[PDB]
Design goal:
part of a larger assembly, 10 chains, A: mainly alpha, Helicase, Ruva Protein, domain 3, 41% helix, 7% strand, B: Glutamine Phosphoribosylpyrophosphate, subunit 1, domain 1, four-stranded antiparallel β-sheet, ATP-dependent protease ATPase subunit HslU (chain A), EC 3.4.25.2 (chains B, C, D, E, F, G, H, I, J)
């Protein structure tokens, strides 16, 4: 079966080497700790699902492209911010990527 | 044929009669002209002489079950298959397609048309007769999109000699 | 239209639909294409274009009036007003006329035609349909004239896009 | 053009647009296609070619004058001047005439036609559009004759490229 | 031609005359128009001018002896060979096919049609004449599907000038 | 349609009505006939029956967003795709394109045309009517290129039966 | 040809080109297509086939002679000689007639037409061009009738291959 | 168009008007119909509806700048591209080409024609008119090939409705 | 042409006149229309305008000298080359072929036809005339197949204007 | 054109006029219609509109200078290039070819025809006129094949409006 909103929430943590862990570790080596609250995991699974039902449904691999946009601000200046516990919550995730509405299909080629 | 579609109160109905005409004779009078697509997610009514009318239907399916049922995108993806260098033949028929979201009319020549503000669509010889009764009703009555399609179809079967009172109607949700 | 007449058991019946069609649209559905002439002692059903159909009819009537209603003679007299030097004017319309004794089919270029042995006559775009169905029933059932007429008419209204099902049937005691 | 007439509640209304179209261009837009005859006690609306439309109208008038304005008899009298030996001359035009008592549709090859039960009549390229819209409103609202006419006329002017929206409506107290 | 198929009491008959017409002349008058397919499992009658009429026949065989004689599937597999991007030419003919289970009509344009409730099928110029006599009989007599096809074929040979009384009938089982 | 383009005082306007005609009926009356291209750098108005009219539009885009929006070069690059050994089909339509620099008219047959000294362009059935009013104004009034396009379009909607007063106008800068 | 007439400020002007074209060649370029009638108190310009144009003209003149030059009554009297039993003979030509008080357009099948509010009339292949140009000028400038006529005539001679620029203009003090 | 070429006293002139006709209307009236080729070594005038008329022009260039400007050889090399097994489409146009040495007329159907003894060439609707005035002059006057082309073009613009007095002339050396 | 073949008493004859017609003129009047195939084993007569008539002949040869002269099989192998997906062009002609065993008629459209019980075959404009005389003779005389072909051909040359009395006959064994 | 070829006393002549017709006008009147092939070994005269007429000429050359000038074999090798599966286009023209040995007529449709006993060949609009005069002479005079061709050509130039008295004749040896 396909992966729902809830199914995208679990695949983000439960699996060994999940994206939540992989970034927790790849950013711990920089000397930085990061918290992935639960109300913020919902807004990443039900925010990568919103994109799969308005474009090609690439599946779980959608999470990678979403995370990479989220862990974009941190991944760059992580070294220059050694020893800090950043709280990634609903407020951060929300204003981390922006919004993604459909293209323009209509107004372009339809009379 | 006479294929009409009205949309009122989160309702999308699509009706059509059932007369297969050959010359000035009637070969089959029960024919289902409005079919369901994508597991029942979209409505499609066709007109334009069996063969082409059908292959146009199929081509829009192979486009829906390849775009997650995104009506508008499926429509344009199909239209673009005519507007290229190497054309996709040319079909003597047109379709009225609609799901919970949008409703359209696609021609086998390669064009997609959106309804006018009132959201009413009709096609086929008995087309404008139904479209005239529909607009009449929608603008002056409270009738449901189903009642209207039902009423409008009959008004058109009694004027068009290629349309009967034997119709099949489908609605969403 | 479809006008058919069967004669069986001292009964003569003339019936026809009521669809007046202008182009491929339908103007009137309750037309009376069969009427009684000469003090109701003779049946007349007409196909062809409306106007001519009526003039061809009104003409046969004046003839019937001048000839004590002799169906056969009146037809001939009328046909003879086309079969001469000074033409009468070709009418695009045919009549099926019948009285107690005879059944005849008169045309607008003047020529009276008698039925074949079976005594069945039919005219109109859906003529042959009614004719086929009628020949079948007369040859394979004990159905009365009236029933065969009624039955054939429908079988034909179902095939002809110009014939409806609103019938007008007249029989002759 | 588009001329339509609805009769309801002891009211008879005859309305029509005003577009005189030469070829695919428009010559006049404020044409009066409906006029009053016999001391304003009878309405007439005409479609078809301008000149013939007029002669067909002027002819029915002279008849009306000679018969105390009996709409029905005048119609027949005039039809009978085509349904004879010495033709009158086929006119490419139709009229819709109506007085307090009757509504009729006369053509230029002579033949008077009565409406179907609903008492609705329409002629012109945009006829059936007004006819559909009209049947819809008469069967599903309590709208007055006048309103139904006005409403249908527009619904049709919107579909026919030969019918505009400048209407001329006449009712009969 | 005139090809008709009736189905009554677990009986499936398929008849057709034998007149090969060229212009308004008769070239061959014995021709077998109804052939047997799949070792005698299915009946096929064709119409539409030799050549195409034949290549359509063959194409339906290469589809039966490639689908275990599954009429309906073979039909659609064939039809789909026209409704694609790269068409399969276009044939000026049509077939009436039927086995113990179902009966169909397949056109060389790419469409399959199922009978109407009565299960009667006819094709060719003499088509509707037979279809009219058939329905007449089926609905008003006890005659076997064979007797009916037989009777209906003759009624049609006496009206169509491209149909004779020299026919070949096949039935199942 | 009527598509017209005037250029006065560093102003480039391009207007067109919004009537999609099918036969002599009107299917859609709001249609945007003037669209924007290359992020809003160029104006394009089309005429010639949906499909082709559109694929001609697209093809000029794939040529602008492949030549840095150089109108003239994009035009000719497109035209040359018709003037070769292996043609690019043939389109039943034409475009009026214009940016701050130049204005043109490209036909789907493979030719590019530059305006005449006054810099006015019109296409479509209502074409010359607008072009006549335009030249009238440009040469005798001070009106802006927008006011003129606006005025000229209406003059043309009142004469062409395939042009309405429901238009969409775009200007640069 | 192109014949146009504008009336503004108690002035009435009728003007037209001078190109007599036989087939796609040109026979005469200095033709006078506008002339004065009834002691120069009424202007007449004619389009259509030469001869007919002339007979249509000479006819209106005799009428004008018999009715003290009443432009309106003369037109109607002449129209009525077509709108009757005994036809006059269809003439392929139109006239634009005008005197101090009225402007009118008369055709050869009998039917007088009045201008729309703006009081502008034009006929001929190049009619609508002059008409569009004229409407533009009358609605947007203070130009005299004469100037607008002169101006529109040219704008039309430039678009019509049958209209040249050699004009003949007549105004009515 | 009207394209004519006279040759007198080591002079080679090639003129042509400037009217682009669409239907019976004039779209552009300045158009350069005579262009220069091979750095100004050869003159080319075309006729036959833009598109093809142009692609024929280009194809003769790709043959000149591939054969050192050898007119005659370039001509034949081009002609031979039509006279093969695999044709080169087919063009609805023809060219008059001439350099200091020779002068020709090449058709997009694949043929090259040499003048007649007098060395005069004309093409297009206005063709023969110019060719008639040309021969008239060449044979009876001393006028230069330029004066003649100039004079002959006008004579042809006053007879052909598709030719104007707005021409562009080129000469060699 | 007129090509006829009779078969009586182990005799197979095949005659044909010799008139090659172009328009309504006669170009060659000796032409051999009946040729011998497979070392003299089979007779072939053609009709249908040289070119195609010939290429149909060759194609039946390349099939005989590839199937051991098995007429029937060679025929069908050829017919099947038309009834496939990728057609074999289409020939405007037909052949009458016959050896000691069988006799046939093959059309360049892809069909093979066997004679009727009497074993008489004719083709070409003069076809049926010969076929009428042939049947007349075979059924009422003792004449040899040769004498009959001879006699029938002449009867046909005297009625068909595209058939002469200059024929070439071949027989087997 | 008019192309004729007579053969008397080891003499083979082939004449033809020189009028290139375009519509009903004459473009070139000196044109050489009879050319020499294979170093002067064979004569060829063509007719049928430049282009095709020419490419048919070339294709017979590429076949002679590839078969040692063997007329008959070169002819058939060329004809066979049309009678195959993959045709060689189709040419609107025909040739009369003759060397010391034989003389033929080859059409660009794929057929070769040999003269009738008298050895006279003619083609083109003026064909039969020359062929009539030729046979007249050959059968009743002693004139040489050259004198005859000369004489016969003129007789045909005076009757055909597409043939002149400006001819070019070639003979062998």
């Amino acid at each position: 079966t396909a992966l729902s909103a809830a199914d995208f929430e679990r695949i983000l943590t439960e699996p060994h080497a999940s994206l939540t862990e992989q970034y927790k570790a790849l950013m711990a080596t920089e000397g930085v700790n990061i918290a992935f609250t639960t109300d913020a995991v919902k807004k990443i699974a039900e925010a990568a699902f919103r994109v799969n039902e308005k474009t090609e449904n690439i599946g779980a691999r959608r999470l990678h492209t979403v995370m990479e946009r989220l862990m974009d601000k941190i991944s760059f200046s992580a070294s220059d911010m050694n020893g800090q516990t950043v709280n990634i919550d609903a407020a951060y995730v929300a204003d981390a990527l922006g919004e993604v509405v459909e293209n323009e299909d209509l107004s372009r080629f339809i009379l | 044929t006479t294929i009409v579609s009205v949309r009122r109160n989160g309702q999308v109905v699509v009706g059509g009669d059932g007369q297969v005409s050959l010359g000035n004779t009637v070969m089959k009078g029960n024919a289902r002209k409005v079919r369901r697509l994508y597991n029942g997610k979209v409505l499609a009514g066709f007109a334009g002489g069996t063969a082409d009318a059908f292959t146009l239907f199929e081509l829009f399916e192979r486009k829906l079950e390849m775009h997650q049922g995104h009506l508008l995108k499926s429509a344009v993806e199909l239209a673009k298959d005519w507007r290229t260098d190497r054309a996709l033949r040319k079909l003597e028929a047109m379709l009225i397609v609609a799901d919970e979201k949008e409703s359209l009319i696609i021609t086998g020549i390669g064009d997609v048309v959106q309804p006018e503000e009132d959201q009413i669509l009709a096609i086929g010889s008995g087309g404008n007769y139904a479209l005239s009764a529909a607009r009449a009703l929608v603008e002056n009555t409270e009738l449901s999109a189903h009642e209207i399609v039902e009423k409008s179809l009959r008004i058109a079967g009694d004027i068009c000699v290629f349309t009967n009172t034997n119709f099949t109607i489908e609605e969403l949700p």
